[PDB]
Design a binder for this molecule. Sequence first.
Ligand code: ZN
Lengths: 7, 97
Amino acid sequence: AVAFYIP
Amino acid sequence: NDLNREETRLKTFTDWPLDWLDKRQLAQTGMYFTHAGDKVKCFFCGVEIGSWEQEDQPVPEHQRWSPNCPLLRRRTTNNVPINAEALDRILPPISYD
Ligand SMILES: [Zn+2]
């Protein structure tokens, strides 16, 4: 999957 | 902050487009539906994940992009699960990275 927001 | 409650997060999965990806397990592990494509967002670490591939799983994908999520790392949070034992069963095993 794709992370659109990363902590 | 009713989104701290699994019950509330589960309710946001109306019109969930992926029949094969369990919305119950996503909600259970911190995710809520953003209603934009198939992207969900963790209420505890804030990671946003979409473009899901059928080979992808809820917890591993979550840990992959947010290895330090408080929920997954098993540290205290304001999460209110529907069933604590079910949550325990699915969260990643304790592992000191
Ligand atoms: Zn998270």
